[PDB]
Curated annotation (Swiss-Prot):
Identification of the protein by name: DNA cross-link repair 1A protein
Any one Gene Ontology molecular-function term assigned to this protein's record: beta-lactamase activity
Signal peptide: none
Superkingdom classification of source: Eukaryota
Single Gene Ontology BP annotation: double-strand break repair via nonhomologous end joining
Induction line: During mitosis. The mRNA encoding this protein contains an internal ribosome entry site (IRES) in its 5'-UTR. This 5'-UTR generally suppresses translation while specifically promoting expression during mitosis, when cap-dependent translation may be impaired.
Organism: Homo sapiens (Human)
Assigned protein family: Belongs to the DNA repair metallo-beta-lactamase (DRMBL) family.
Major localization class: nucleus
Coiled-coil boundaries: none
Lineage of producing organism: Eukaryota, Metazoa, Chordata, Craniata, Vertebrata
Key words of the record: Cell cycle, Cell division, DNA damage, DNA repair, Hydrolase, Isopeptide bond, Metal-binding, Mitosis, Nucleus, Phosphoprotein, Ubl conjugation, Zinc, Zinc-finger
Length: 341
């Protein structure tokens, strides 16, 4: 049974609601982005209309084998009519193809569904600038002040500098980056670029990256692992055992591994600054956990909501416990009293 916070009132629309069977009343299923918790339930035998970005559409077709007749890609930043209702897709600053959706209801109500997003001041000059939003369905992943982390630019600067130093000191070192979904591609792309290398990966991960409309992608990635000194592996293999095993396969070409595990927030954010971050080391293998987030920090979220001044907020993350729900409701009231809406 589909939960209330995935239904759009006054419409036949659901958002990220593919694991509940045939939802009664739903004429169009929107998909904000290609992450498994959100697409859960979609497969090649789906037979209702799916509305999404072009990039999400590419992934549905090629990775999940959803038939072409049911995929409805929409351009960004463009007023579109779907089943008699005006909608707009906006960039979410999440993973490739991720969108927020603006719905202009027949009765005059305006609803923004953020999907998953990393709020940014640039959103204050999108098509949101114009007008009033009555209901906000909000990605509240990190809605508590303890959730701090650096900008994506600061994290990438650290990764580039760390990798360039290590390989200039030891030209026989291999760099490895963990992945388990789309998103955070800048980490491995920026490291490979500083090292003058393509990024090597499995056939399955290459296929995924070929769906993302990244400019000049054929110049940046490869399935030929031997030609590359930056490799991608599943996140699960980024540990001393898995990396030891990988180094064996490389045919005495390398004598050191430097590995990166992009995480979200971890409690080491509460003590250590990005500049002060150190790896876990065993012999000739070192592993860095780096806090590269594709969700809003608490401060970024607060800024966005205080700018938008929505009449009602509906959280879409951390809704499963009374304590979490109460905590979020308290912050929403603080933000409203401070800003005066
Ligand atoms: F949005 C929320 C609000 C509250 C919580 C509960 N845990 C928060 C604690 C542990 C880690 C940092 O503070 C989770 C998500
Ligand atoms: Ni996501």
């Amino acid at each position: 049974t589909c939960p209330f916070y995935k239904k759009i009132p006054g419409t036949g629309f659901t958002v990220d609601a593919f694991q509940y069977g045939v939802v009664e009343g739903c004429t169009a299923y929107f998909l904000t982005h290609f992450h498994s918790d959100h697409y859960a339930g979609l497969s090649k035998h789906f037979t209702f209309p799916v509305y999404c970005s072009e990039i999400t559409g590419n992934l549905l077709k090629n990775k999940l084998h959803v038939q072409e007749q049911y995929i409805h890609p929409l351009p960004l930043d463009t007023e579109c009519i779907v089943n008699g209702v005006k909608v707009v897709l906006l960039d979410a600053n999440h993973c490739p193809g991720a969108v927020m959706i603006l719905f202009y209801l027949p009765n005059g109500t305006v609803i923004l569904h953020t999907g998953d997003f990393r709020a940014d001041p640039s959103m204050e000059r999108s098509l949101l600038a114009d007008q009033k939003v009555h209901m906000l369905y909000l990605d509240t992943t990190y809605c508590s002040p303890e959730y701090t982390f650096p900008s994506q630019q600061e994290v990438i600067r650290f990764a580039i500098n760390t990798a360039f130093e290590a390989v200039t000191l030891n030209p026989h070192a291999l760099v490895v980056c963990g992945t388990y979904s789309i998103g955070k591609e800048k980490v491995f792309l920026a490291i490979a670029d500083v090292l003058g290398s393509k990024v090597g990966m499995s056939q399955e991960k290459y296929k995924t990256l070929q769906c993302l409309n990244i400019p000049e992608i054929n110049s940046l990635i490869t399935t030929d692992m031997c030609s590359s000194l930056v490799h991608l592996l599943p996140m699960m293999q980024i540990n001393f055992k898995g990396l030891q095993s990988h180094l064996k396969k490389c045919g005495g070409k390398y004598n050191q591994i430097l590995a990166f595990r992009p995480t979200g927030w971890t409690h080491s954010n509460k003590f250590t600054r990005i500049a002060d971050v150190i790896p876990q080391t065993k012999g000739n293998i070192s592993i860095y956990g780096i806090p590269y987030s594709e969700h809003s920090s608490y401060l970024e979220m607060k800024r966005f909501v205080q700018w938008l001044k929505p009449q009602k907020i509906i959280p879409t993350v951390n809704v499963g416990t009374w304590k979490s729900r109460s905590t979020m409701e308290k912050y929403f009231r603080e933000w409203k009293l401070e800003a005066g809406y």
